[PDB]
Amino acid sequence: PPVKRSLVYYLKNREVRLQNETSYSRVLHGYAAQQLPSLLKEREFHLGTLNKVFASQWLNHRQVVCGTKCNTLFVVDVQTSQITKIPILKDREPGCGIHAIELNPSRTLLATGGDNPNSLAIYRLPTLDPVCVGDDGHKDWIFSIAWISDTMAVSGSRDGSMGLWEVTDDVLTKSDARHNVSRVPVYAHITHKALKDIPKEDTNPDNCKVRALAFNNKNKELGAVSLDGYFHLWKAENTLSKLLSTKLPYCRENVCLAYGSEWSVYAVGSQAHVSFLDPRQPSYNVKSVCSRERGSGIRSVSFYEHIITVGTGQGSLLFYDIRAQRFLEERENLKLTTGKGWLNHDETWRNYFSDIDFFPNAVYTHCYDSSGTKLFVAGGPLPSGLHGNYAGLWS
Amino acid sequence: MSYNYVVTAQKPTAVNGCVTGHFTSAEDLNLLIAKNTRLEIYVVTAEGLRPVKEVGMYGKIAVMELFRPKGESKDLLFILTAKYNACILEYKQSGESIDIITRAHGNVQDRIGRPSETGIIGIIDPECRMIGLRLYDGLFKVIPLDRDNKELKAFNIRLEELHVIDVKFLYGCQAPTICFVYQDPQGRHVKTYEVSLREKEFNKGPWKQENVEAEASMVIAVPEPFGGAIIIGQESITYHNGDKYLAIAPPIIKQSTIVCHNRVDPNGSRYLLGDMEGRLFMLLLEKEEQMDGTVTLKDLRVELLGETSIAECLTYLDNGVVFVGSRLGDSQLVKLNVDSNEQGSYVVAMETFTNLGPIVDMCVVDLERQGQGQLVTCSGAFKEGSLRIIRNGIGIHEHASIDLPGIKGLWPLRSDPNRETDDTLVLSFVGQTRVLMLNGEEVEETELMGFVDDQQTFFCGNVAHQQLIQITSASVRLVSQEPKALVSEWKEPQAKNISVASCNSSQVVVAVGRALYYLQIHPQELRQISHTEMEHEVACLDITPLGDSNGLSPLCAIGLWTDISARILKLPSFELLHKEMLGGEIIPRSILMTTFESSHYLLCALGDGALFYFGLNIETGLLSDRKKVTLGTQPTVLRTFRSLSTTNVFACSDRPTVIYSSNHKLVFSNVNLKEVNYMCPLNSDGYPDSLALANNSTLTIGTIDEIQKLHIRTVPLYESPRKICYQEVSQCFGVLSSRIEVQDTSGGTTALRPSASTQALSSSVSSSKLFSSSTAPHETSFGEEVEVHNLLIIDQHTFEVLHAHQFLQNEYALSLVSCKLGKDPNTYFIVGTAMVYPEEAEPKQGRIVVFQYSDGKLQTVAEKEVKGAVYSMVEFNGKLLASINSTVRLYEWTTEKELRTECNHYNNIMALYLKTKGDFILVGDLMRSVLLLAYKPMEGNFEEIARDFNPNWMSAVEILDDDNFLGAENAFNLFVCQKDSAATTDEERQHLQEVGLFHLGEFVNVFCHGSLVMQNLGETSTPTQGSVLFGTVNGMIGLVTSLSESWYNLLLDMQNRLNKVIKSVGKIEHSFWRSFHTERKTEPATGFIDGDLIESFLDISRPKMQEVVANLQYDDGSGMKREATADDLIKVVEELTRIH
Amino acid sequence: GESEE
After folding, report:
1. CB contact under 8 A, B1080 and A1
2. Same domain, B425 and B276
């Protein structure tokens, strides 16, 4: 007996409740993942004078949190186009911007860079109340975060260290007991459960920066990508423990990492190519697809069923199909391109970039909502000397 | 903002759960049945199922279980809704009042959790220590059954096994013990745990994990003395208990999947098993009793009993009777015999319960072309598939018809003094009288001795002292029953002709001009007592006996020719007790006094078809509680009748009506008759409890059906219908349907059973070449079930299958429309089809076929190949608009009779639904909600105007008006979009706003514009405007209509007030129940009035009505607001009850 | 082309 995969059976069975199965779940979403990219249209938002958006996640069907190079943390109501700023959490001590935002699997805790970029800030969801202090575990900025459980998060940094943090019930109850007594919010205290550095390779021993993290829930692995071109895999069942290290086929701008749970494949961005790695495979068994957007860099990547969505410095999003092993074509690779957003004609632009009226808004972050039909895209100009933001909702 | 009123026209009928136990008492056996939101409680009796109580819960029922904690005298009932409201319910009766009392309740939803893929499961331990609920993967939620746990507080035990298929509590274990089948990467396994309430965790179970059949699914816990568990797969049945394992694999079960079970014997010796095809099996456990006193299973045996309706749940009741609850067809009560029949089956049907569900399609038509509307639905699936013809009003069976034109009235007579049955029926004609002899069911024209043949009879009937009376224009004649001869005659002193007459057991009243004469009936003698003169000429009079009186009445009701009024006179003196003005332009033609459920009422009808009815106080002759209902446009005649063991009133008109009482309230329903002028009751030895209805040309003799708001007629197809449309030109319905055939070793396919598509009066097969160039790689596989599709052409009058046309191999007929195209005067049936193969996620090939039905032959006019499946088609301005996969396309009909593409739209994921009005197209998407397109004839293309950006999985769509669009979604929620006329920017204009959200609790298959009550024909006095019917998978029919702002505010205020007075079962908040709900978001209901709640205002007693009304400001239409009285909302609500 | 961090 062959597998019944036809969507006509799903529709006609649904009309009868004739066991329209959960078997079709991968058919329905896989079909949508191929259809959506050509149906999307841009609705830009005006964020004012914020510097760049570096991280973003959906908090609700209606709201997206965004972190910025200005260190501002803010929320967009994408239905009303309304911007709400959030207080930035300070450290245990009275001593860049927000390069990473992450949600724990149960969506009760949000993890961001703090007022100190070296320090992890935790907020309570959905309210955005503070939970705990900015720490002093890292000596430099937090580049990436990954919630390996509802209580445990790993955080990378420019010094190459990986802090493992656990928000225990005590941390929550101390935050809540303190906020009920003191009208001014007072944090709970935190420290890393363990602090481990990535193995130092023959490459520059200071350039051990861990730029991206991704969690494989199936095997309880944490994958990690450094900017020296090396990929690392760690077991994350209970505590951060090394499994293997593999050198990536490309060692340039390895800034984003995503994991396809339906493929057991890690997608790794680079200055030009997306690489598809499987740590259980031989090191030569790696697929590499060239974006051809050469010189602009891949800046964000994610899996939607069997489709990879790739944001780039050419302010453009490509879509790639694993099963077909090629880009989606337009109804000639299909690509969206961001609008102009807003640029600040500041002194640096005046001196070095004044000869250019328009720059592409690099997609530093993108994410699909829970329905799988809306794609939030945000970023800013590629050059570090340029100040100005871009955001919009594609639907 | 849009304002919409939504009400249920037909309650859901498909069963989704059933249980048996001692719930209403410690002694009675009950069957509790759950149909979506409705809980129905029956008492099991030797005769059948006797309903006691029915309850609408503010929630869709998912779990329903009877249980009995220690110290309870009778079972308690646990219910969990799909919104996770949980409650424990107790049934209590005090005197005549029955209430369902919530002992405990609480919402048991968890903020995080994947809802489990085998659906909600809920189970109760055999000693009632806990309820265990499998709501989410990886978690087992336990509710301790502490008698003090008034709030259903619960804790979760984490479960290592994520994907759990079925779970049961085992019997005989000391600790409550959970046994379940779960699916590992290595296959399916049986595992057990002991459940600790003190530690709130799982402990190692009493026996080891076992591998089981890969298709193992259903788990049957086995009671003592056996203990253990039976596991049921696709091929085998296995028993596990401790170390013992015992398995059988009967070939007799391998053909169909077992879907449900029910324990026959309290000791576990026999179980019923049911399956996908409706085959009912008995599984028997052969036991060996050992010399040490223990009991062990010896072997398992499976036997086939026969076929039933497809079972959703079985329940063995008692005495061999099984309730076969069915979701896909009519539910059945069946009896199991010891000895098989000639066909080898032991199953004999006892009773059948109508199920409209699932309603996959419908249309509203006027077969009588009257403009009322009857609704014809595609219902059921597989061998249960049928058409149902649904019509608001009361049915009649014609048993005889006689050519007797010009009848001016009818009356029964019993000429044989030894008979209670009618033996004679008198026919009134102008200038003559004729008599029908009644001999069984046979009826013949004759003459009755003592009666005048050359005069018009205005009344006759049986009277006291074993005599008959005939009242004719010239005289009043008393005729004895024996020897059928005149005994006395009375004549009017002024020698004027009688125009109206009425008589009972002893009283005679005749109207002669303005004079009313009263006579007494004595043995062989008539006597005049008194007479009066009315101010105006009498148009009608009635002295029909009331209540339990022995054919007597102290009152006479009359109507007049001049002042258009009704009056009550006291006999014999004809004293005026009450005068009531009827109004209108046309005089009363008939007046009637009747008794409804022992209550006394007066009815009077005008020649304009208007009917006025009043409560009647006999002692004082006064009228009260006056109400007006228009029945027709022609003069109406009011008469009593006896049938269904009750007394009621029939109104003869161009729109004949039966007036009947329910719960001491009058209900007026149209009758399924073309026309009636006069009538009388009939009670012969062949026609007991019957009617004689005289129309313009013939006399119709017959019986009334059960008095139901909607009458339903069933036409079984024995195969699944898919779409229906009506072609008036050919007097035919077109129905897409399909049957399952099994592919044999010959490579061909054979039908499992005969069905409408093979049993047709003629048939044809698609002779198309279009897809001959390619075949599926699995086209030659064996044993695979293949669905074979047909277009049936069905006679509108007989419902016979006039023709059946078969589609290609592997071709699905998806959509059907009947319309005229272009300038072509021919009406065509247009079918959209698709080629379907299991290995393809989406179809790449399909075609549109234009058929014409003429001279008994369905002819193919044209074929068009399309690269995709045709999901929907509509007629759009003489052009054919079709949804093909992800695109919407518009076809022009050429003079060569071929379709030609003009324009299209590509902005969809999958366009499943199409509705149009004017130049506007509403398109429903698989995932992206609804979008609005418009056709621009000047450019010859489509332009997208606005769309809803809130993602929604559409099940149906409809256009309510130009700006307001109605959607239905997979999660049982209805919503209204509105074009944003307030928009000032382009981005705002392109967004449709949600101006209403409402959780309906049904999956809606189809929306249709129409009504089952007579259309308004331009009247604007109705507070509601527009009428959209909809059908659901549970067989529920609902109605949506629009409200003006003032009505919306009045009813919304009233709605919030009702929710503070009427306490629901389970104590579930109405605002929570109706709030829009999905995995992604929850929102309060707005823009919609719950008509099922508003109408409940007429059920609550006045003491509670006054609580709702007090301090409410009401606009009486003057524009001024005044404090409302109880009867102000009653009037408003009763008007709302007339829309369905 | 002064890429961010």
Report:
1. no
2. no
Nearest to A135 by CA among A105, A159, A163: A163
Domain tally, chain A: 1
Mutate one of A382, A387, A389 to test the C interface: name it (highest C CB count within 10 A): A382
Task: Verify that B354 and B421 share a domain, yes or no.
Answer: no
Q: Residue B880 has which token pair?
A: 């054919």
* Subunits in contact with chain B (3 or more CB pairs closer than 8 Å): A
List of chain A residues whose C-beta atoms are within 8 Å of the C-beta of residue B955: 14
Shortest alpha-carbon distance between residue A278 and chain B (Å)? 21
Q: Measured between alpha carbons, how far is A237 from A240 in angstroms, rounded to an integer?
A: 8
* Chain B residues closer than 8 Å to A395 by CB: 949
Are C4 and A253 within 8 A, CB to CB? no
Is there a single domain that holds both residue B200 and residue B305?
A: yes
- How far apart are the CA of C1 and the nearest CA of chain A, in angstroms? 5
Q: Please state the φ and ψ torsions of residue A248, each to the nearest 5 degrees.
A: -75, 150
Same structural domain, B293 and B414: no
Flag whether B touches C (3+ CB pairs, 8 A cutoff): no
B348 and B409 co-located in one domain: no
CB contact under 8 A, C1 and A295: yes
- The CATH number of whichever domain residue A191 belongs to comes to 2.130.10.10
Strand ranges in A180-237 using DSSP code E only, listed in sequence order: 192-197, 210-216, 221-226, 230-235
Whether residue A22 lies inside any domain: the answer is no
CA dist B244 and A342 (Å) reads 75
Instruction: Tokens for B320, please give them.
Output: 């061999």
Distance of CA A253 to the CA centre of its chain: 16
Nearest CA in chain C to A294: C1
In chain C, residues with a C-beta closer than 8 Å to the C-beta of A52 are: 4
Query: Residues before each break in chain C (C–N > 2.5 Å)?
Result: none
Q: How far apart are the first and last CA of chain B?
A: 25
Structure tokens at B882: 């079709």
Assigned domain for A215 exists: yes
Two tokens, residue B330: 């009519």
Determination technique used: cryo-EM
Q: CA torsion B468→B471→B472→B475, rounded to 10°?
A: 100
Domain membership of residue A33 (yes or no) is no
The CA-based angle B151-B154-B155, given to 5 degrees, is 155
Beta bridge partners of B611: B605, B629
B951: closest CA of chain A, how far (Å): 7
Which has the closest alpha carbon to A281: A300, A303, A305, A265?
Answer: A265
Token pair for residue B117? 């893929």
Please check whether residues B342 and B437 belong to one and the same domain: no
Please tell me the distance from the alpha carbon of residue A377 to that of residue A387, in angstroms, as a whole number: 18
CB contact under 8 A, A364 and C4: yes
A218 falls within a domain? yes
* Whether residue B319 is found in the same domain as residue B404: no
Answer yes or no: do B346 and B415 share one domain.
Answer: no
User: Taking chain A, what is the end-to-end CA distance rounded to the nearest angstrom?
Assistant: 39
Print the domain residue range for A288. 42-394
Query: Looking at chain C from residue 1 to 5, which residues have their Cβ under 8 Å from any Cβ of chain A?
Result: 1-5
User: Are B12 and B35 spatial neighbours (Cβ–Cβ below 8 Å)?
Assistant: yes
- Under a CB-based contact definition with an 8 Å cutoff, are residues B1124 and B1106 in contact? no
Scanning every residue of chain A, which has its alpha carbon at the shortest distance from the alpha carbon of C1? A383
Q: Which two tokens stand for residue B370?
A: 């009257």
Question: What secondary structure does DSSP assign to B1036-1077, as a single string?
Answer: -EEEEEEE-HHHHHHHHHHHHHHTTTSPPTT---HHHHSSEE
Check if the beta carbon of residue B932 is closer than 8 Å to that of residue B920.
Answer: yes
Which structural domain range is residue B91 located in?
4-359
Q: How far is CA B270 from CA A201, B22, B321, B867, in A?
A: 71, 21, 14, 54
Residue numbers in A near C2 (CB within 8 A) = 382-385
Pick from A54, A69, A382: which is nearest to C3 by CB? A382
